Design an enzyme around this catalytic site. Structure first.
Site, PDB file in Angstrom:
ATOM      1  N   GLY A 198     -95.919 -32.445   7.605  1.00 45.15           N
ATOM      2  CA  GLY A 198     -96.217 -33.902   7.124  1.00 45.15           C
ATOM      3  C   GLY A 198     -95.219 -34.971   6.984  1.00 45.15           C
ATOM      4  O   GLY A 198     -95.792 -36.245   7.226  1.00 45.15           O
ATOM      5  N   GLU A 199     -94.094 -34.794   6.965  1.00 46.34           N
ATOM      6  CA  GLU A 199     -93.080 -35.704   6.735  1.00 46.34           C
ATOM      7  C   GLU A 199     -92.822 -36.351   8.185  1.00 46.34           C
ATOM      8  O   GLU A 199     -92.705 -35.777   9.488  1.00 46.34           O
ATOM      9  CB  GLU A 199     -91.880 -35.407   6.501  1.00 46.34           C
ATOM     10  CG  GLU A 199     -91.972 -35.169   4.712  1.00 46.34           C
ATOM     11  CD  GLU A 199     -90.855 -34.477   4.072  1.00 46.34           C
ATOM     12  OE1 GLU A 199     -89.728 -34.666   4.337  1.00 46.34           O
ATOM     13  OE2 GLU A 199     -91.501 -33.523   3.330  1.00 46.34           O
ATOM     14  N   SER A 200     -92.295 -37.910   8.187  1.00 41.52           N
ATOM     15  CA  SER A 200     -92.065 -38.605   9.275  1.00 41.52           C
ATOM     16  C   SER A 200     -90.986 -37.959  10.231  1.00 41.52           C
ATOM     17  O   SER A 200     -91.294 -37.829  11.515  1.00 41.52           O
ATOM     18  CB  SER A 200     -91.670 -39.895   8.977  1.00 41.52           C
ATOM     19  OG  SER A 200     -91.206 -40.694   9.904  1.00 41.52           O
ATOM     20  N   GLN A 201     -89.798 -37.709   9.690  1.00 38.89           N
ATOM     21  CA  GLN A 201     -88.679 -37.054  10.542  1.00 38.89           C
ATOM     22  C   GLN A 201     -89.172 -35.552  11.126  1.00 38.89           C
ATOM     23  O   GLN A 201     -88.661 -35.452  12.027  1.00 38.89           O
ATOM     24  CB  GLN A 201     -87.642 -36.951   9.710  1.00 38.89           C
ATOM     25  CG  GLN A 201     -87.599 -36.146   8.570  1.00 38.89           C
ATOM     26  CD  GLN A 201     -88.171 -36.303   7.416  1.00 38.89           C
ATOM     27  OE1 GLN A 201     -88.445 -35.664   6.548  1.00 38.89           O
ATOM     28  NE2 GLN A 201     -88.803 -37.679   7.365  1.00 38.89           N
ATOM     29  N   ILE A 241     -92.399 -34.835  12.014  1.00 38.07           N
ATOM     30  CA  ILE A 241     -93.396 -34.594  13.175  1.00 38.07           C
ATOM     31  C   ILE A 241     -92.524 -35.020  14.242  1.00 38.07           C
ATOM     32  O   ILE A 241     -92.492 -34.530  15.373  1.00 38.07           O
ATOM     33  CB  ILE A 241     -94.218 -35.919  12.747  1.00 38.07           C
ATOM     34  CG1 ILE A 241     -95.283 -35.323  11.556  1.00 38.07           C
ATOM     35  CG2 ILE A 241     -95.083 -36.106  13.886  1.00 38.07           C
ATOM     36  CD1 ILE A 241     -96.005 -36.311  10.972  1.00 38.07           C
TER      37      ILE A 241
END
Length: 211
Positions: free
Chosen positions: A105-108, A110
């Site tokens: 789920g987190e930006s980095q 993905i």
């Protein structure tokens, strides 16, 4: 007495115990799987192959979280290769990808997954530059986005999939807006109409899902 076994009760029992340990903490589960002989060795190749082949037997969320860990890039790269994305559009490849594990789920997180996917995707194609064309409708060999371009398109695909299948959206994203925002994203040029059209209609008609 109790079980025929050939129903392989003993093998299944240890597998269940090992996989439970993995779903809980891969740091503990992987060495247990190796110790029990389900994974040949502690090499990234053997661990990757096991994860890839047992996607429906272990927690797909845990698998995704293991793969996106900064210090697990080596494993992720071994894993991503096992896939055969040859001759597939980026969206068709993504569908295959997301059947083995669930995106973190987190930006980095993905970003790490999609970066590995994009490089692997390009590596799987036979990019013969003389074939590049903006109008060879339905000819996959004529559209050759580089890794950065596949990365951007991949994000747009996940984004579109959500919009087109979100009942809360009053006006689902039109093809014009989907394609318009992608201008200059195929090797600093535009993706051919047909490529984005097939992508758009495929996502529209069959939501990418589950795991």
């Amino acid at each position: 007495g109790l079980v025929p076994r050939g129903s392989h009760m003993d093998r299944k029992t240890e597998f269940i115990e090992c996989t439970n340990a993995f779903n809980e903490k891969p740091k503990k589960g992987i060495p247990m799987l190796i110790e029990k002989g389900f994974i040949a060795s502690d090499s990234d190749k053997d661990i990757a192959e096991f994860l890839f082949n047992n996607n429906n037997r272990m927690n797909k969320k845990t698998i995704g979280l293991l793969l996106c860990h900064p210090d697990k890039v080596s494993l992720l790269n071994e894993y991503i290769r096992l896939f055969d994305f040859s001759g597939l559009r980026v969206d068709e490849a993504i569908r295959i990808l997301l059947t083995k594990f669930r995106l973190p789920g987190e930006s980095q997180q993905i970003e790490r997954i999609i970066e590995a996917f994009s490089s692997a995707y390009c590596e799987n194609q036979d990019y013969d530059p003389s074939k590049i064309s903006d109008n060879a409708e339905d000819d996959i060999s004529t559209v050759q986005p580089d890794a950065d371009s596949v990365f951007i398109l991949s994000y747009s695909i996940i984004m579109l999939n959500t919009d087109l299948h979100n009942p809360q959206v009053k006006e689902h994203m039109s093809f014009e807006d989907y394609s318009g925002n992608l201008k200059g994203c195929c090797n600093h040029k535009d993706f051919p109409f047909w490529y984005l059209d097939r992508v758009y209609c495929s996502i529209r008609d069959k939501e990418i899902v589950m795991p």
